Subunit: 314 residues, 4 copies
Amino acid sequence: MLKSNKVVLIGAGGVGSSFAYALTIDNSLVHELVIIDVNENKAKGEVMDLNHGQMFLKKNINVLFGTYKDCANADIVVITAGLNQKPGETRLDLVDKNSKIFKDIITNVVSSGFDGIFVVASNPVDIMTYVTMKYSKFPIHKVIGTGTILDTSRLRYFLSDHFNVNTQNIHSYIMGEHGDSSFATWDETKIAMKPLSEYLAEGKITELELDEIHKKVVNAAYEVIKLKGATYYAIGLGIKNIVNAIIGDQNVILPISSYINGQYGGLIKDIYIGAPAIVCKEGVKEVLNFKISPKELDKFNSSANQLKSYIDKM
Amino acid sequence: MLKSNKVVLIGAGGVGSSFAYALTIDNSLVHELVIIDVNENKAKGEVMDLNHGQMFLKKNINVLFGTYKDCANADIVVITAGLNQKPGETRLDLVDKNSKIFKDIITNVVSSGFDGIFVVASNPVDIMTYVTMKYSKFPIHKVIGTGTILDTSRLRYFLSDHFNVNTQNIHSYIMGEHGDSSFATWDETKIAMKPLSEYLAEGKITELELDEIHKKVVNAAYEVIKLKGATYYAIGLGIKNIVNAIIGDQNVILPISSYINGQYGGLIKDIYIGAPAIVCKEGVKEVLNFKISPKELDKFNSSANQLKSYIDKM
Amino acid sequence: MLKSNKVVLIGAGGVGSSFAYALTIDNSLVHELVIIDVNENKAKGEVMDLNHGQMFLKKNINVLFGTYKDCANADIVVITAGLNQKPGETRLDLVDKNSKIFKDIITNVVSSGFDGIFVVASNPVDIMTYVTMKYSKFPIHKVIGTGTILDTSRLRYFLSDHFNVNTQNIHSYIMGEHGDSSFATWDETKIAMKPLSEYLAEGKITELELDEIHKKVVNAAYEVIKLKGATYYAIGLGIKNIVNAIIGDQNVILPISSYINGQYGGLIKDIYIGAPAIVCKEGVKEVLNFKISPKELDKFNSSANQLKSYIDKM
Amino acid sequence: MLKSNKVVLIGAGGVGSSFAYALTIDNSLVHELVIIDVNENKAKGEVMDLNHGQMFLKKNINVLFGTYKDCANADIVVITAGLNQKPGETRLDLVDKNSKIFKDIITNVVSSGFDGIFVVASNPVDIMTYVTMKYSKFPIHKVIGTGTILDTSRLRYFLSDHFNVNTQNIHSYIMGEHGDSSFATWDETKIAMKPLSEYLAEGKITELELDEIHKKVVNAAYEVIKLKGATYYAIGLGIKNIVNAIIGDQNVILPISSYINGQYGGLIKDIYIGAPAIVCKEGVKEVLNFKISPKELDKFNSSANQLKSYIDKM
Ligand SMILES: NC(=O)C1=CN([C@@H]2O[C@H](COP(=O)(O)OP(=O)(O)OC[C@H]3O[C@@H](n4cnc5c(N)ncnc54)[C@H](O)[C@@H]3O)[C@@H](O)[C@H]2O)CC=C1
Ligand SMILES: NC(=O)C1=CN([C@@H]2O[C@H](COP(=O)(O)OP(=O)(O)OC[C@H]3O[C@@H](n4cnc5c(N)ncnc54)[C@H](O)[C@@H]3O)[C@@H](O)[C@H]2O)CC=C1
Ligand SMILES: NC(=O)c1ccc[n+]([C@@H]2O[C@H](COP(=O)([O-])OP(=O)(O)OC[C@H]3O[C@@H](n4cnc5c(N)ncnc54)[C@H](O)[C@@H]3O)[C@@H](O)[C@H]2O)c1
Ligand SMILES: NC(=O)c1ccc[n+]([C@@H]2O[C@H](COP(=O)([O-])OP(=O)(O)OC[C@H]3O[C@@H](n4cnc5c(N)ncnc54)[C@H](O)[C@@H]3O)[C@@H](O)[C@H]2O)c1
Ligand SMILES: [Ca+2]
Ligand SMILES: [Ca+2]
Ligand SMILES: [Ca+2]
Ligand SMILES: [Ca+2]
Ligand SMILES: [Ca+2]
């Protein structure tokens, strides 16, 4: 029989609100969208503002103010709650703050009876995916993090503007930690079928500009925060696409926070890191295994070791 | 010869940014979006955040930070700049400040050689539309204000929730000044082909409940501002829809800020007010005229007299 | 847990194939589409042609050759099987022949354990909807026919071309039999908020031009059959919208083949006929009832009495 | 100022009508669609059938029956007119017949004053693209053929079913003549960024399976023709995607009938053949030049030799 697909959103700030907006505009069958925030006034205001535009939507959608009661029968739970760049300094203190919040949130969600899929966006996304997995006891393939999807989006925009080519034809990935230790898969990048190495040999692009594009990908968050306070639109679209791919059972490969256990180096094991995986109706279907050049394998290993280091502390 | 369609957005606040985001998601052929703001940092940050999500869009779109000089060959100019009102404030009050702002903006735009269509969202929207028309000396059919489209969307959502029927089947308008003096076309309202009067007879809705819905429509702005600082999602969708109807040459009737000079009894003439008009590629094709209940006509004339009072102060 | 929505198409002719194509293009999430035809080569070929274009679709979709075995776990069964009307042949001339086909189809379907929703398009659509309900022994809310949705689309196109106004703003229905006994709700018709009587008064349209539009609606099928043998595009879109409205649980009012037993004066009861009804996740939520002019009521009763003259012979 | 975009379709058969249907459903702002056919009755019937479903479309669009005089101000001309291969008809016979038909069509069109873009689909599509360019005298960049876009779509569907992965991650081309002398770019294929080589090593696929996939791609046309008479859905979607890429100025790379004179070793020059090119508002912006394995270059040169000989005959 036909069912009502339910998505609960925990965290009604810039990122969560942007995701909800984009989802109401472009919906792949999300019958009910439930919004939860510790600041209940903000959640109620967002629910009202999103409902007031139903007349302009292609489809109608039930946007509801919610409590954790609502997670019992939910099909997806999207977490965007946290302290976006808090004041005390230190990203280890950030991890502590946000994992403290996640303890509470996850306990409430699991005590509700929820048995769907987690989609995690709160920073540091990889560590918070790990924390969600452990605090919840869910299977690893029911816990997803956005990982390097936003970094990959930025990378592909930079390459599209460089070559003046639709992002549709830009086949490159950012992998590793969603942060400063990320790396681009330069050696495996293609523009449509044309390898990047041919573009280098023909002089359209140089290794210098590749270094600069990567530095740009890494500095984009800081640039945008300086310019406008926060970043939410691109990540909102990424979250929306993950959700639509899940509910669409599209078997699509995405650069998400993936749990690796031998893939790539046979060295990196037992953590969530930015990597390509198949997404479908049940969550993660497969963590893809492919060879990366030695340079990029060393970068991957260093990134995973940085992640292990930050986990160890707490 | 195929053309590149250009929209210049002036005012990169909540409303303008929401409209730009929605437009990038649901794009009816806008090839170039130029974002202007007296706060250059905010415009640049919004441009970067909007471009970093191209990968997730149906179609790539060129988004630019620009300056008034870009209005020269622009096809549409959307103005969302000004003061946005806060607790204990109204819309009919930010009139002299916002009119000065519009003087400056319009002078710059027209000086650049622009000759396209103005789409005005800033408040008080009817008054600012009249101001745009007279400062620009453009044809009146090239000046569109958003009018009562947001009020109408809210009304239709409330009626949809009451009857649990898709908004598509809700045929009702809010008319008059976008604000406190507005009214609903209760006596002309239908659910599909079923008159609202029949629902009243059947006891499925009450007169008191209609008055409740109208008070909710009028107080929605104050509610949502109290709850989350400002409204911007619904109005962003409405602006997106107006822009797409223009570029698409869709000949669609919308309740916008329309110039009346004889319609609805001709008691009040030569002002912009919330009323239905046909929108097309060239701007406003017609401002329609239909008979409304006598009580509703009295309400309409009261609203128009308030507006004309504020305008005659000049 | 999330679900795979399944639609089984029975009848891979022009109408069925148009519906399948349109659905693959504009897919409110059918994860699986099965195509059944007594001419199995035709079904195989259609399946292949539909799958060969997956690269150009927004979303992938599994299109399968199947048999009645596939109806067991089907969420929706669309029936487009039957006999086309030949030149000089009315829809009702098919009653006998097609009735026999349905007896077989409905038999097999019911034997597989299907307990979803029927969407009936084969002609004469109202009588075939009644026959489906009687053979299947299903609840009346689980059997839907397209009724006068196609005639209504035609009426709205003709009015949109007369007034040069988007079909969005054309609020008029064709009701009664999907055939030569249909009528238009001229007295209840409105263009946005503006009644049709006001256009008549202003001379923007004449009574005789309304009669001409009705005659054109009635004779559209015969004209198109003469010109190219059969119609399938418009009805393809109509069925597609019905299906997406069901799966989307959109609670949308549509002029479908609705079961009446007391509505519209109760002078004829216990038939299916073209009338407005709410569509949602599990079929028909409610068959509406509104008051229509006495002449229109005489026409409605004539049509209903014709349809019952046929149903009584059964 | 804003322009109306005009597409003129010559040939209202299966392919042209499917393209028109798909375009009305998924419309990147074609304001006017004009359908021309020597068989006036068929064109009129299709115009009526497409118009009768406007109420179900996301956007309204003026679909009109017309004559060659309408090409004067057309922005795109899509030619689907001509015969398809029959049993015992070689590419040579089809070339003869369809080149005569194109003589007629191109003469009429150019006499009308048309100065837009040609999109060619009649078979053999590479030769007919060359012939359109030669007869019209238009620039090379203003004459586009569908090339191997359909064979590429079929290839990617087959790989998507085999690897059970979204077509959106299947990076592989069919190149050469749109026919039996086509070949797959096996040695440059990647799923996401896992080379097909790696899939072969692990036994996930075999060489015989690749040969059978290429055989299926080459035989699909005959199979579907035997099964249901003709193919037209997939190529309809392909033509629609090309038209929307054009009007959208999307700068997208597609495997179309591209004019080569140096690329791929430059052994054969001055022909249209299935190859990747950037599509934009002005037509073909650039014909790309990635380089391929020795096997595949031998195949490509054989195919180009075929085409060039058939051309030199004339
Ligand atoms: N139905 C409607 O039409 C509605 C109208 N609204 C009004 O829209 C306007 C914008 O609202 P918000 O975005 O929420 O407020 P906001 O402060 O977040 O944004 C206003 C923007 O305008 C900028 N600005 C000011 N002057 C100029 C100038 N001369 N040139 C360029 N930019 C300038 C300013 O820097 C700011 O970024 C306000 O007047 C609102 O009252 C808001 C809600 C709905
Ligand atoms: N509701 C509406 O508005 C309209 C109703 N239409 C009717 O829809 C029906 C189909 O029309 P067309 O597609 O043009 O005709 P068609 O000949 O092209 O296709 C009908 C299909 O039904 C097949 N069929 C017959 N019996 C069975 C069976 N037991 N199981 C499976 N398949 C079977 C048959 O092989 C054929 O392929 C006709 O009855 C039309 O009169 C057509 C147009 C619009
Ligand atoms: N994964 C990515 O690519 C990426 C992109 C941008 C930033 N982020 C991060 O994700 C989060 C997004 O934050 P933001 O930009 O929306 O800032 P924000 O402050 O506007 O939103 C954070 C929300 O979390 C709420 N919250 C706090 N504790 C809560 C609790 N126990 N339960 C429910 N809600 C609670 C807060 O009330 C607030 O509304 C941050 O951690 C941010 O650093 C993710
Ligand atoms: N990937 C591809 O390129 C591909 C795929 C399928 C078939 N085709 C080809 O497209 C063309 C149409 O295929 P079809 O299946 O629709 O066959 P069809 O017979 O159904 O349609 C051809 C149309 O062209 C019309 N026509 C003939 N001569 C004309 C003239 N001088 N002026 C105007 N119109 C004329 C005919 O009236 C007919 O309607 C064929 O050449 C076919 O081989 C393209
Ligand atoms: Ca550039
Ligand atoms: Ca309710
Ligand atoms: Ca007209
Ligand atoms: Ca006339
Ligand atoms: Ca498979």
